[PDB]
Design a protein around this ligand. Sequence first.
Ligand SMILES: [Cl-]
Ligand SMILES: [Cl-]
Length: 228
Amino acid sequence: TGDQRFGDLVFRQLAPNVWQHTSYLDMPGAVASNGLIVRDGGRVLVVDTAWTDDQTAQILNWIKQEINLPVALAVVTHAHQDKMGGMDALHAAGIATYANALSNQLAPQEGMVAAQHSLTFAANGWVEPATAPNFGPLKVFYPGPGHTSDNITVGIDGTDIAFGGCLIKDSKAKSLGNLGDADTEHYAASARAFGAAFPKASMIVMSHSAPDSRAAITHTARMADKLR
Ligand SMILES: [Cl-]
Ligand SMILES: [Cl-]
């Protein structure tokens, strides 16, 4: 209970300044996609678009009318439709968009529109600060290939929250979902690297489940072990 709707796109509050935006697409069943909205000082930061441009425009309208702070940047966590399907709506609103350089390189073949800006990463997985200017509380981390080769993750400074995207499944999941683009061999390690990158996080947000505990990370690596 307690999950606010606006148009067709649930917002749920996670922390006083972190909302979960949820949109739905129908996979002829229906499927939820989760993303984040972050209030940091006098601007708004977004993580992940919705499945489509119209849903993404709704997210923007909402920010305008529930937060009323202008959207500074948006970060998308890889080149899949649940994360990137709404790029045009972001660009029409003139919002600076960032993704892993690799996500941007793969976006055309994945049917997605590229972000305007490319994030690069060090060998230890942390984002190069100068490719991510003014991200504020957003801490961007590339844990290695897993769900896709380009998947990145984001921690929120000043919260128990880290966002795993489609990389992490929930603690009671019966599978790792879509392994279509998966790196089987490195998945377990990547799931574990995300865990270790945000060691103090206890609320883990993922793409198709309510926020879960760290058991989500542990369980996902367990399942991925059985792959390799
Ligand atoms: Cl499941
Ligand atoms: Cl942490």
